[PDB]
Design a protein around this ligand. Structure first.
Ligand SMILES: CCCCCCCC/C=C\CCCCCCCC(=O)OC[C@H](COP(=O)(O)OCC[N+](C)(C)C)OC(=O)CCCCCCC/C=C\CCCCCCCC
Length: 269
């Protein structure tokens, strides 16, 4: 088992992010879908478990050629399908990724708190004090080029080179964070606690570390994009998002069937 907390500080409010995250996840999902691989949405509906209200989503990721060669080698044919269930009770979210073949020996749990600060809160998820001390804290800086994998870099998705037309939140320079700190502009931080378990003798350490590395990468590219697409979603209402999600669900079903594979790829070459 491996636990890490990823902190993503953004130049936007917690309120704006609720819309921004959904808009960005919808677009990022389409960018990964095609040629038999990609995202499939099974459910996206409201819920009210116990005394909690929120949005529930059930999605399946088809990652045949997106996983590294070593994973295709050990995985039975047709088992590289992953279910992602998420109970989004924004500003809080609980997501769990599972795999049918792995049953209980595999899971990716992502628990996120969205707060109006700059990633200074400690143990926001209130984990056991001693356990918390063994959790690695990863600070994701969407403006830091060094945190981007060369293969993923795109100058048109570089927040360090982009300026919003509708908010004027100019290009994020090296010291944008400290600047924002003393700039009473919207600010927030997503504390994403990721707990990974991959029980498989001989590969546990390797696979758990691999998945954390990939979650880091996915969080990094997604939020860099989220920021650069800010003019696309900054003026949207939750209602426009629910309309977009309905359209997206349908567009995914069709994309996944046609064309070739597109999007992010992982390789332990
Ligand atoms: C033997 C049989 C088993 C073999 C398996 C062993 C090998 C292990 C290899 C792969 C296993 C891991 C697969 C996990 C799939 C990755 C997706 C993921 O982990 O989704 C969770 C993240 C964080 O959850 P969230 O609540 O923050 O967001 C959700 C927003 N809500 C709540 C509104 C819905 O969701 C997001 O960021 C959403 C961002 C959307 C963009 C998705 C990009 C990923 C698509 C392709 C990349 C694939 C690379 C392969 C490596 C995968 C490792 C991660």
């Amino acid at each position: 088992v491996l636990i890490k907390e990823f902190r993503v500080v953004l130049p936007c409010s917690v309120q704006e992010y609720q819309v921004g995250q959904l808009y960005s996840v919808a677009e990022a999902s389409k960018n990964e879908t095609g040629g038999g691989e990609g995202i499939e949405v099974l459910k996206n509906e409201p819920y009210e478990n116990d005394g909690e209200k929120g949005q529930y989503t059930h999605k399946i990721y088809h990652l045949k050629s997106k996983v590294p060669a070593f994973v295709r080698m050990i995985a039975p044919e047709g088992s590289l399908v992953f279910h992602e269930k998420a109970w989004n009770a924004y500003p809080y979210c609980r997501t769990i990724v599972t795999n049918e073949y792995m049953k209980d020996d595999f899971f990716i749990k992502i628990e996120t708190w969205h707060k109006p600060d700059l990633g200074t809160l400690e143990n926001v998820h209130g984990l056991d004090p001693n356990t918390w001390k063994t959790v690695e804290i990863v600070h994701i800086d969407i403006a830091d080029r060094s945190q981007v994998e060369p293969a993923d870099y795109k100058a048109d998705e570089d927040p360090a080179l982009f300026q919003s037309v509708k908010t004027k939140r100019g290009p994020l320079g090296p010291n944008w964070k400290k600047e924002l700190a003393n700039t009473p502009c919207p600010k927030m931080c997503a504390y994403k606690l990721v707990t990974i378990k991959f029980k498989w003798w001989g590969l546990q350490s390797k696979v758990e570390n691999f998945i954390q590395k990939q979650e880091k990468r996915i969080f990094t590219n997604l939020h860099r994009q989220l920021f650069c697409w800010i003019d696309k979603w900054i003026d949207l209402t939750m209602e426009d998002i629910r309309r977009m999600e309905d359209e997206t669900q349908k567009e995914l079903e069709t994309m996944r069937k046609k064309g070739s594979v597109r999007g992010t790829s992982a390789a332990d070459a």
